[PDB]
Design a protein around this ligand. Structure first.
Ligand SMILES: CCOC(=O)c1c(C)nn(-c2cccc([N+](=O)[O-])c2)c1C
Ligand SMILES: [Mg+2]
Ligand SMILES: [Zn+2]
Length: 326
């Protein structure tokens, strides 16, 4: 089949920054997370290493993917597939060669896959301000992130979905802890603290003669994995412009829908959520200057000079967005 052939060809770029993820979503019948996760697991030999039955992996992935909302413009299965694939590329950074174990690799990829599952398309602050059941359950802290974790793990208990069935008890405990530590770190309210700690690691950085990072204890290892997945989460502005612009269109649609809910409820409209008073291009330049560039520049220092091409693209995109402002 032509559709199946073109999908296979697009998936050959799975190890590259700038994978045509939207095209893959279309060609796979809206199954980018399932096909990209399966491809990556095969590429890294994770099914054999952890004795994961192929049917079990696909069943879990399809179930997980079904729990991403198809009517949420940004925080959906395409975003999850994109973060998974971006983490997969970051794990292959020369400076991290042989740094992480297969279990740590599995944890980072799994964390990426479930990190926004069942996202309702509204922010933690909106959930807190509307006295939502989610904010009540989670006592106003990392409300969404706790929920994404709970759903991602609970789905492993569905029929033929336990992809970790052949891991030892110790491996399962370690993976669970790492996944929780990683997904909770994707809460944007923790960004400044995560970045501050990453900068501290860079200053005291220890490397081999080839530039490979030397991370001994759990605190340092998980910190790098947390920042890696956080970078993947915040990687849209570092992708080829055609991809970045699509992600911007999607987050603005999602944000505007939240603002529409806020406006009708008589709530103050959140930043970037007012479709009648928006400055999309100025907001992207601000996002890059204050959040994305500071993070990626620090990551680039940690793995110097492996992230130079990513940083170059980010700066090209910032320049272009700035040029659209008269
Ligand atoms: C593609 C442009 O993206 C954005 O402008 C943008 C802004 C601002 N915040 N966020 C955002 C919102 C919730 C969570 C995260 N995240 O955890 O990375 C990022 C995005 C994706
Ligand atoms: Mg999130
Ligand atoms: Zn995300």
């Amino acid at each position: 089949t032509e559709q199946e052939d073109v999908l296979a060809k697009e998936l050959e770029d799975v190890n590259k920054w700038g994978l045509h993820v939207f095209r893959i979503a279309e060609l796979s019948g809206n199954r980018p997370l399932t096909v990209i996760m399966h491809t990556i697991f095969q590429e890294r030999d994770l099914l054999k290493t952890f004795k994961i039955p192929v049917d079990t992996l696909i069943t879990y992935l399809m179930t997980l993917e079904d729990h991403y909302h198809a009517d949420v413009a940004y925080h959906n299965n395409i975003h999850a597939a994109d973060v998974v694939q971006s983490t997969h590329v970051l794990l292959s950074t020369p400076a991290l060669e042989a740094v992480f174990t297969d279990l740590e690799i599995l944890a980072a990829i799994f964390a990426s896959a479930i990190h926004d599952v069942d996202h309702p398309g509204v922010s933690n602050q909106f959930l807190i301000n509307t006295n939502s059941e989610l904010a009540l359950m989670y006592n106003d802290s990392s409300v969404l992130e706790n929920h994404h974790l709970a759903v991602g793990f609970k789905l492993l208990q569905e029929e033929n979905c336990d992809i970790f069935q052949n891991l030892t008890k110790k491996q399962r405990q370690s993976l669970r802890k790492m996944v929780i530590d990683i997904v909770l770190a994707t809460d944007m309210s923790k960004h400044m603290n995560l970045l501050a700690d990453l900068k501290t690691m860079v200053e005291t950085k220890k490397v081999t003669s080839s530039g490979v990072l030397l991370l001994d204890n759990y605190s340092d290892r998980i910190q790098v994995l947390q920042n890696m997945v956080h970078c993947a989460d915040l990687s849209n502005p570092t992708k080829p412009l055609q991809l970045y612009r699509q992600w911007t269109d999607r987050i603005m649609e999602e944000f505007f829908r939240q603002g529409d809910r806020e406006r009708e409820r008589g709530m103050e409209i959140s930043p970037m959520c007012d479709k009648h008073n928006a400055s999309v291009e100025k907001s992207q330049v601000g996002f890059i200057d204050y959040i994305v560039h500071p993070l990626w520049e620090t990551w680039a220092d940690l793995v110097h000079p492996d992230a130079q091409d990513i940083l170059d693209t980010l700066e090209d995109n910032r320049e272009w967005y700035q040029s659209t402002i008269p």
